[PDB]
Design an enzyme around this catalytic site. Structure first.
Site, PDB file in Angstrom:
ATOM      1  N   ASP D 304       0.844  -1.313   0.106  1.00 31.31           N
ATOM      2  CA  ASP D 304      -0.119   0.076   0.051  1.00 31.31           C
ATOM      3  C   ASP D 304       0.830   1.207   0.006  1.00 31.31           C
ATOM      4  OD1 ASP D 304      -2.173   1.952   0.060  1.00 31.31           O
ATOM      5  OD2 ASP D 304      -2.932   1.040   2.208  1.00 31.31           O
ATOM      6  N   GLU D 345      -2.875  16.886  10.348  1.00 25.52           N
ATOM      7  CA  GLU D 345      -2.030  17.063   9.136  1.00 25.52           C
ATOM      8  C   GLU D 345      -1.684  18.549   9.084  1.00 25.52           C
ATOM      9  OE1 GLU D 345      -5.094  15.620   9.243  1.00 25.52           O
ATOM     10  OE2 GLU D 345      -4.802  13.545   8.351  1.00 25.52           O
ATOM     11  N   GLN D 377     -19.889  24.388   5.514  1.00 23.52           N
ATOM     12  CA  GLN D 377     -20.396  25.147   4.095  1.00 23.52           C
ATOM     13  C   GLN D 377     -19.249  25.547   3.213  1.00 23.52           C
ATOM     14  OE1 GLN D 377     -21.559  26.267   7.117  1.00 23.52           O
ATOM     15  NE2 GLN D 377     -23.656  25.362   7.000  1.00 23.52           N
ATOM     16  N   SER D 378     -17.974  25.282   3.800  1.00 20.33           N
ATOM     17  CA  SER D 378     -16.802  25.859   3.063  1.00 20.33           C
ATOM     18  C   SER D 378     -15.818  24.735   3.162  1.00 20.33           C
ATOM     19  CB  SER D 378     -16.222  26.949   3.650  1.00 20.33           C
ATOM     20  OG  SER D 378     -15.752  26.939   5.063  1.00 20.33           O
TER      21      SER D 378
END
Ligand SMILES: [K+]
Ligand SMILES: [K+]
Ligand SMILES: [K+]
Lengths: 557, 187, 27, 679
Positions: D304, D345, D377-378
């Site tokens: 992987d 991250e 929404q963003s």
């Protein structure tokens, strides 16, 4: 003397590979069901007017066709000898045989062996010989090839379940391999001086007052596949030294070629089907190296010969006793390795009268699985029980499953080759144990001392390994020996056929892989140097204590 | 099943009823002398075959190898051989006797004995001795017939087959063809 | 062949029968 | 973890008490050695009757035959149980970590709920439990709340800690590891009995380990060799009794044992155990022996991308190239945006970007750091810490929210998409007002020195293939850094089954290696399924082999054991079968010198008496089992070579060493019975 001793071996193998090369491609077409040029259309009639549907068959159905042929293979022959007296072509008045002597030889000619415990010219009529002992001399040499055709097929099929068809095979080995080759081998012998007639026994008033009754009969027909099928049933008592069976040296050199003609070209045919020519070429390179070593020992041990002959005022110590002076010692020592390593059993020279160091190698080469250039049939699968053994303990010391020609060797194909090897050193170690525990076996000896043990040991070794050779001092006309061998012969053949078909039936359902960076090269002078090292060790560690009480105890004394 | 028995009954006719017949027909259509035993005859009588060999107890003949078959030596109804081993002391009873019947039976020849003339043979029907042993027993037989060596050695080299290649077999002197033609030279 | 000879034979066939039974099994 | 103790003088003292508990009739599953047990049995039963009344009377000799045949059986059970005793303390080196725990749970599924005091064994699958920092993990599970670094040293011996995340790719937490930094709320996925630690316990502790299908096929030869040597020795008595007088049974049992391959039947049960213990010492958990034995033949492996090759952190940070923006102002507010990027991250650009600068001239929330999390929404996280807005522009929504005011970039950012194609990253775009910062990309960060390991793996002749579900674009720059043989991207887990059957149809053995739940269909169908330790707890269970330190090239240490569990099996066969040549040159001139005196010329080694020669054979067959216990435990070391160049090598040591060594061993031991001069 070794200058003309080395030339005999090199001439015998030079002519051998030249003759076995175009017969290898001949036997290659019959494995792949390719008809020979000319037989097409003829087999359309003979497989249909008789009626064989060319139906492909699995190994269980295949096994009860070769065995099924060889169950009425002996049922005819056991009745042709008890009811021998009610049969034509008897110019003498030979009666029906005894039940023990019949059962000894009813088994013996089915079983690719031809043990003869009788004087053939005072036992058998012609119809007892002609249509009873050549009809089984074909159907035992073909019965061995129809096994080994279904083992070379088991290495080239991919994930199938059908080996071939037995009756479609058996009508090709007889009608187009055995008969048209042993017709020219036959008709060459009549020109050279052999015997082929139906006359009664012609009496002779000699140049002196004594008379003698020369036995005549159809010999050179029965003689041709006596050598071609590696079968060894001589018409007379002397299997290849009677002058009507082998008149000159040139017949002898044809008969040495005729022994290694099928089981040498059948391994060239093994190279053709797998695609790799060197895959089958290494297999002769492992057989014949054991053969050349096991001839130079015997030739050396007979040029030295009997040391007592010098003290008794002869010319040399050369052991010309029990050898025909038509033949040399070098030719007689060559034949007695060919006829015992290859399951033939034609005696050219009475094997008792050898030196014990040179009489042990023809008793070695039977006991070592009957493998080295072995019999028609048993020469290849007898080696494939040691190839599939040497693939195991070579691939496993790489860190690899034991692959041979892509096919893996799993547990089910080792539970069988264990049981397939263990038949032949059981019976020669149980029969030789049983015949020394009794008084009906020990009293049949001829020579005294350690050599008298070797006559018991050579006899049962030429029963389980299906040779047919004999020391012939063993007067084996007792009902014990006629039935002890008939057990040890019938199991020594058909207790190896069953775990070879079970090997071969397990190798068709697998899938052959491809070569790669890490698969072990089966060809080459390493694996041959291991295959010889595996044959000559498992056949060594299991018979030295049987040989050290036999001829090794005779030689050192 | 049914075609299994139907194959064997066809492999009983072509196998041992056609093939040995077809050799028998072609054996006598081409090779009439050898196929009937390769006999040699004197009119109605038969002086043996050229291959089997006889008993030659008489003086003025060439002695063959000792046979040791069942009843009489050179008996073609047994065809066996003396299977005496090297380690058998009964073997030295014979060989020391077979020189004692042959050292003081060839008193002008070598003190050594050729090995063929003293040991047995394989089939017990060996019609053949080596030319050295054939030339060994010259000076008695020429003395026993008042013949010369230089024609008798020439007589031996007449009936002396050799192999096609000098190691396939051994050089070979025939006996029955010699001794039957030895009496023709006597007349 | 005394009484102890047939004892030694059946001790072998016990072992020869046992090892064959071990060979036909993945015990 | 010393990982190697041959004689630690306390295991062997605790061994002999168990070895004598293997003498009675439980050896009959080992038929090679069970004949030696009966061989040692009746030689006492002969010598006891020989002590009182028998036809011979040399009881001082035959009791010395049985005085080493039991020692031979005692040495076979010695090496069998030593590797079993090796794996006791090998398992107890980590078994003594699991029972040192007791738990506590939160009754509401959030951090900061009602507590209790419940021991860890009473727990089940699906329990909201709390572990604060400084403790040890009581049970396995997945991290759902909180992110911390844990010390995985108790179970696999590490100097370094390892970090975790909630609901990402660090769901792996193993019960028994210490936690260091912060709190974690985990939910248990296993049960006591289904425990990951129980996988090692019940396999080792017990005789439940079945024979591998190549160990089975080797005994079939080792039975069939004893079937002949039963025949070729016990039928020597009728062979010898005829000529003269017979041979005593006391020799024919000594000859029967000295020909039976006793030096394998004493070690074949030890190789199959000590090889599995060397697997655990190399931090690899094997479910059975078959996957180890099949691993010697594997020529195709798969990997992987996410987690196997790299650390699975799916994060990077390279630069900010932008006109007017200083290189000093790289971490000016993008670091604050990475402090606004509250995902782990986003913690990379905090760390990886400052590794050249370390410009730490700020505080957390001193400048009114409006930490806005990952929105809906963003679909982004931002901060109003400058006067302008600072929002993480996504792939498509640069125009939708960040450049929605009408202001855009000059076309450099259009070629930054092209620079993603030159990088193969998972990029993030930051634009602060008209001043376009541009793109901070997140490629992957492949950890180890894998370049030498793949080069070591190509000499072993195994094709290396990269398999990922991500696109072809990312796989280019990763493969050039990795050095793999081939690569193939854009694969569903159904398509990952559609490559294994593109090799298993060609007959090869396939080594899947992965971590994810996409790997779990491929792992449960492939042959050697090496599951990473960073992977999900449904993928480790669906595989057949689990690493302990997330090393992708630790299959190299698997094939180095699956070959050693074959090279040791193969060599000792051709060692023991080659031994029997010199065995007949010790027994046969000595065993028959009463009957056949002319066999004394076969005594090559100039052995002294016809009794000490047989004693030298039985002693040498007993000593050489012990002197090959370090061979059966430490394996057979090897240069990684080709087939026909190693088979030449592996027969100089054994196929020729098996000839010469018994020609030495019988001489020395008979000289020891001559200097001492006992018998
Ligand atoms: K015979
Ligand atoms: K055979
Ligand atoms: K064997």
């Amino acid at each position: 003397m070794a200058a003309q001793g080395f030339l005999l071996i090199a001439t015998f193998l030079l002519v051998l590979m030249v003759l076995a090369r175009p017969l290898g491609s001949g036997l290659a077409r019959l494995i792949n069901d390719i008809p020979l040029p000319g037989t097409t259309g003829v087999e359309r009639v003979l497989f249909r007017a008789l009626g064989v549907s060319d139906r492909e068959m699995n190994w269980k159905q295949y096994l009860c066709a070769i065995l099924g042929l060889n169950m009425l293979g002996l049922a005819v022959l056991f009745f042709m000898l008890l009811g021998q007296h009610y049969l034509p072509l008897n110019p003498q008045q030979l009666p029906g045989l005894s039940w023990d002597l019949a059962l000894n030889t009813a088994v013996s000619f089915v079983t690719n062996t031809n043990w003869q415990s009788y004087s053939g010219e005072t036992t058998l009529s012609y119809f007892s010989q002609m249509a009873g002992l050549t009809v089984q001399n074909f159907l035992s040499a073909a019965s061995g090839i129809a096994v080994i055709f279904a083992l070379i097929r088991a290495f080239t099929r991919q994930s199938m379940s059908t080996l071939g068809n037995a009756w479609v095979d058996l009508l090709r080995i007889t009608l187009w391999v055995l008969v048209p080759v042993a017709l020219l081998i036959a008709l060459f012998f009549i020109q050279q001086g052999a015997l082929q007639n139906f006359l009664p026994y012609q009496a002779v008033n000699t140049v002196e007052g004594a008379q003698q009754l020369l036995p005549m009969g159809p010999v050179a027909s029965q003689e041709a596949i006596k050598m071609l099928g590696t079968n060894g049933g001589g018409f007379f008592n002397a299997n290849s030294s009677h002058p009507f069976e082998n008149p000159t040296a040139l017949t002898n050199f044809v008969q040495m070629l005729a022994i290694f003609l099928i089981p040498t070209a059948l391994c060239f045919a093994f190279g053709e089907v797998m695609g790799d020519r060197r895959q089958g070429r290494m297999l002769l390179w492992a057989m014949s190296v054991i053969f050349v070593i096991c001839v130079g020992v015997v030739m050396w041990a007979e040029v030295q010969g009997n040391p007592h002959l010098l003290a008794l005022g002869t010319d040399s110590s050369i052991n010309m006793e029990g050898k025909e002076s038509r033949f040399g010692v070098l030719v007689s020592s060559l034949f007695a390795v060919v006829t015992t390593a290859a399951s033939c059993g034609a005696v050219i020279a009475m094997h008792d009268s050898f030196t014990a160091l040179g009489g042990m190698v023809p008793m070695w080469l039977m006991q070592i699985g009957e493998v080295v250039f072995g019999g028609v049939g048993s020469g290849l699968y007898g080696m494939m029980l040691f190839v599939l053994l040497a693939v195991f303990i070579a691939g496993l010391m790489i860190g690899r499953t034991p692959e041979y020609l892509g096919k893996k060797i799993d547990v089910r194909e080792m539970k069988l080759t264990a049981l397939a090897i263990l038949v032949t050193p059981t019976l020669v170690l149980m029969g030789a144990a049983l015949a020394m525990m009794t008084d009906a076996g020990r009293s049949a000896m001829l020579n005294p001392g350690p050599h008298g043990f070797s006559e018991v040991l050579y006899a049962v070794s030429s029963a389980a390994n299906n040779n047919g050779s004999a020391f012939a001092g063993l007067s084996a006309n007792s009902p014990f020996w006629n039935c002890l061998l008939a057990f040890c012969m019938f199991v020594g053949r058909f207790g190896v056929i069953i775990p070879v078909m079970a090997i071969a039936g397990s190798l068709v359902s697998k899938k052959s892989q491809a070569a790669s960076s890490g698969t072990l090269p089966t060809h080459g002078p390493l694996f041959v140097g291991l295959l010889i090292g595996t044959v000559l060790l498992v056949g060594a560690l299991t018979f030295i204590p049987a040989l050290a009480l036999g001829p090794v105890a005779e030689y050192l004394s | 099943l049914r075609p299994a028995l139907s194959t064997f009954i066809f492999l009983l006719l072509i196998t041992g009823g056609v093939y040995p017949l077809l050799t028998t027909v072609l054996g006598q259509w081409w090779f009439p002398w050898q196929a009937n035993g390769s006999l040699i005859r004197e009119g109605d009588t038969v002086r043996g075959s050229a291959l089997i060999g006889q008993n030659f107890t008489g003086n003025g003949y060439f002695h063959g190898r000792p046979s040791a078959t069942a009843e009489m030596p050179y008996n073609p109804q047994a065809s066996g051989g003396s299977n005496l081993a090297v380690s058998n002391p009964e073997l030295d009873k014979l060989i020391a006797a077979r020189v004692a019947a042959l050292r003081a039976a060839n008193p002008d020849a070598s003190a050594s004995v050729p090995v063929e003339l003293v040991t047995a043979s394989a089939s017990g029907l060996d019609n053949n001795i080596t030319p050295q042993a054939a030339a060994w027993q010259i000076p008695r037989v020429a003395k026993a017939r008042n013949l010369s060596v230089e024609q008798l050695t020439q007589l031996i080299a007449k009936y002396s087959q050799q192999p096609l290649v000098k190691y396939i077999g051994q050089p070979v002197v025939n006996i029955v063809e010699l001794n039957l033609a030895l009496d023709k030279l006597d007349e | 062949m005394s009484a102890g000879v047939i004892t030694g034979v059946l001790l072998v066939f016990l072992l020869l029968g046992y090892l064959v039974y071990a060979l036909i099994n993945a015990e | 973890k010393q990982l190697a103790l041959f004689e630690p003088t306390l295991v062997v003292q605790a061994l002999k008490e168990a070895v004598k508990k293997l003498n009675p009739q439980a050896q009959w599953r080992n038929p090679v050695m069970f004949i030696v047990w009966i061989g040692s049995l009746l030689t006492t039963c002969i010598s006891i009757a020989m002590a009182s009344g028998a036809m011979p009377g040399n009881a001082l000799f035959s009791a010395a035959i049985s005085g080493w045949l039991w020692i031979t059986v005692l040495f076979a059970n010695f090496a069998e149980a030593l590797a079993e005793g090796r794996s006791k303390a090998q398992a107890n080196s980590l078994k003594g970590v699991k029972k040192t725990a007791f738990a506590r749970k939160l009754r509401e599924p959030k951090y900061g709920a009602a507590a209790d005091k419940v021991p860890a064994d009473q727990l089940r699958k699906g329990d909201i439990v709390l572990v604060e920092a400084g403790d040890i993990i009581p049970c396995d599970g997945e991290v759902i709340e909180g992110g911390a670094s844990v010390d995985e040293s108790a179970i696999t011996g590490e100097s370094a800690p390892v970090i975790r995340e909630s609901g990402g790719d660090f769901a792996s937490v193993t019960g028994g590891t210490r936690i260091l930094s912060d709190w974690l709320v985990i939910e248990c996925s296993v049960n006591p009995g289904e425990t990951f630690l129980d996988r090692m316990i019940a396999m080792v502790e017990g005789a439940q380990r079945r024979k591998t299908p190549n160990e089975i096929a080797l005994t079939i030869l080792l039975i069939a060799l004893t079937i002949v040597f039963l025949l070729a020795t016990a039928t020597l008595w009728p062979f010898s009794a005829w000529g003269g007088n017979a041979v005593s049974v006391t020799v024919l049992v000594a000859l029967l044992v000295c020909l039976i391959p006793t030096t394998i039947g004493g070690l074949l049960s030890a190789i199959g155990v000590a090889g599995m213990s060397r697997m655990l010492g190399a931090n690899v958990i094997a479910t059975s022996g078959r996957a180890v034995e099949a691993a010697g033949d594997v020529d195709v492996l798969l990997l992987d991308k996410t987690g196997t090759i790299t650390l699975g952190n799916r994060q990077a940070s390279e630069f900010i190239p932008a006109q007017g923006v200083d290189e000093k102002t790289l971490a000016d507010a993008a670091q604050l945006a990475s402090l606004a990027d509250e995902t782990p991250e986003g913690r990379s650009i905090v760390i990886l970007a400052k590794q050249r600068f370390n410009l730490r001239e700020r505080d957390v929330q001193s400048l009114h750091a409006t930490f806005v999390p990952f929105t809906a929404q963003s679909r982004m996280s931002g901060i109003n810490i400058d006067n302008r807005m600072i929002r993480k522009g996504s792939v498509d929504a640069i125009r939708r929210h960040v450049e929605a005011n009408g202001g855009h970039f000059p076309t450099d950012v259009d070629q930054k998409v092209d620079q993603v194609a030159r990088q193969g990253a998972t990029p993030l775009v930051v634009v602060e007002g008209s001043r376009v910062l541009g793109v901070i990309a997140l490629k992957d960060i492949v950890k180890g020195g894998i370049k030498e390991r793949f080069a070591q793996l190509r000499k072993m002749g195994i094709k290396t293939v990269m398999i990922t579900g991500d696109n072809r674009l990312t796989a280019a720059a990763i493969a050039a850094e990795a050095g793999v043989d081939d690569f193939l991207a854009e694969a569903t887990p159904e398509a990952k089954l559609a490559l294994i059957r593109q090799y298993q149809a060609e007959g090869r053995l396939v080594a899947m290696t992965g971590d994810g739940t996409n790997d779990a269909p491929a792992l449960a169908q492939a042959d050697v399924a090496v599951a990473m330790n960073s992977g999900t707890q449904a993928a480790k269970e669906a595989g057949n082999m689990v690493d302990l330190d997330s090393n992708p090239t630790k299959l190299i240490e698997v094939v180095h054991i699956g070959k050693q569990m074959l090279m040791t099996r193969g060599s000792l066969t051709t060692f023991s079968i080659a031994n029997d040549v010199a065995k007949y040159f010790a027994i046969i001139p000595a065993a028959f010198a009463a009957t056949y005196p002319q066999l004394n010329a076969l005594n090559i080694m100039c052995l002294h008496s016809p009794d000490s020669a047989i004693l030298s054979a039985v002693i040498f067959n007993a000593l050489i089992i012990v002197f090959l216990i370090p061979l059966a435990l430490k394996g057979v070391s090897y240069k990684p070579l080709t087939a026909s160049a190693m088979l030449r090598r592996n027969l100089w040591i054994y196929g020729l060493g098996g000839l010469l060594v018994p020609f030495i061993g019988i001489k020395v031991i008979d000289l020891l019975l001559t200097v001492c001069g006992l018998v």
